């Protein structure tokens, strides 16, 4: 929906005269801004507990800046999408840079083939695969060969004007 930013949200409910400071729950959520972040947390607590937006309070909002935003990490993520004729689960693995990048490239890819909008997709868990050769889907393991190399055939150059004079080639 935008340049995605992960968030953590902490909720303490409303302390009654009997049970103050009940649980101080927490959840990791994937959103674009703090305004939507404070709304997904309630949308996800109501599906698991007996508290709602009225009977609740946001304690703290924080952002987890990546410790290694430069290393090419490996990710395996589970998705639960409310499809046209029900819901289903998958295990899709992708590696762009990091979590916020992986979530972004997930949604376009997830909506590309399954036509599942942002409001019909559940993010189960995002974790980094520590040891190599622990991935099952072949299209990701395919790019882990030692000293991989391949060319880029059929290069197309970006014309500036509307006319060219030399019949440009497609070399690279």
């Amino acid at each position: 929906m935008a340049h995605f930013k992960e968030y953590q949200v902490i909720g303490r409910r409303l302390p009654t005269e009997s049970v103050p400071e009940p649980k101080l729950f927490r959840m990791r959520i994937f959103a674009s801004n703090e305004v939507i972040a404070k709304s997904r947390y309630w949308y996800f607590l109501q599906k698991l507990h007996k508290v709602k937006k009225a009977s609740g309070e946001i304690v703290s909002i924080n952002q987890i800046n990546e410790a290694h935003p430069t290393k090419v990490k490996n990710f395996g993520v589970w998705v639960r999408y409310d499809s046209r004729s029900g819901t289903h689960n998958m295990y899709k693995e992708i590696r762009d840079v990091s979590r916020v990048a992986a979530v972004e490239t997930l949604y376009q890819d997830m909506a590309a083939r399954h036509r599942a909008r942002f409001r019909s997709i559940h993010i189960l868990k995002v974790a980094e695969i520590e040891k190599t050769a622990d991935v099952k889907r072949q299209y990701v393991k395919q790019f882990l060969t030692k000293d991989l190399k391949f060319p880029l055939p059929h290069r197309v150059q970006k014309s500036t004007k509307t006319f060219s004079y030399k019949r440009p080639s497609t070399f690279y």
Partner: protein, 222 residues
């Protein structure tokens, strides 16, 4: 009388000390805001340093600006806008936050885009789009003597006095907000930023509560 040497000098003498009162009161104010954030930012630091979390008090006032036009409005929402002094498209007033007031907002969301404003936004709105009320007769604020002639018997002998109550929610705040004509704003300069304006801000639209994001939208209008 001659009216050439005595009254005019005294009139300037009375005027010159009034500015000193405004300046001295502003010096009191300017110390107050800096202590405000310096004590809530530091308290936020000390909560984490003590192993805890700090929840600040919710914002005590919101700026509500109409998004929808005038046609095709249901009767119950329409009466809400009239009581909110929100008549035209792109018109805004400062609304006190209260459970009594909050229920109207959640009933008028499809036609307003409100949120928590910041002192910078209020600073320009009062200065630029400042309109008084004297037997109706909406007139620009401009001078600092018109306000004391209309609010002096409720205190507030300066425009800086008025802008402090419109943000800090003073005791006599309702009529202080009611003294100001509804803020008539233009269309956003940089655009609304969304394809369709009538989706909720969570759903990628414009209407509904947007907390602190209203500051960016208002600055384009003002």
């Amino acid at each position: 009388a001659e009216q050439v040497a005595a009254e005019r000098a005294a009139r300037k003498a009375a005027n010159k000390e009034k500015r000193a009162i405004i300046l001295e009161r502003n010096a009191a104010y300017q110390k107050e805001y800096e202590t405000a954030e310096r004590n809530i930012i530091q308290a936020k630091r000390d909560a984490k340093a003590a192993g805890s979390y700090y929840v600040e008090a919710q914002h005590k006032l919101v700026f509500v600006v109409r998004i929808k036009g005038i046609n095709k409005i249901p009767p119950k929402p329409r009466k809400v806008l009239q009581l909110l002094r929100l008549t035209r498209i792109n018109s805004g007033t400062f609304v006190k936050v209260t459970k009594a007031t909050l229920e109207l907002l959640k009933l008028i969301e499809p036609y307003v885009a409100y949120g928590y404003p910041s002192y910078s936004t209020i600073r320009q709105l009062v200065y630029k789009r400042g309109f008084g009320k004297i037997n109706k007769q909406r007139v620009p604020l401009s001078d600092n003597a018109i306000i004391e002639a209309n609010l002096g018997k409720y205190g507030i002998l300066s425009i800086d006095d008025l802008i402090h109550e419109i943000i800090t929610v003073g005791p006599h705040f309702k009529q202080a907000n009611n003294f100001l004509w509804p803020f008539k704003l233009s269309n956003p300069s940089g655009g609304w930023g969304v394809p369709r304006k009538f989706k909720h801000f969570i759903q990628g639209g414009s209407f509904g509560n947007r907390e602190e994001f209203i500051n960016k939208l208002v600055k384009s209008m003002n």
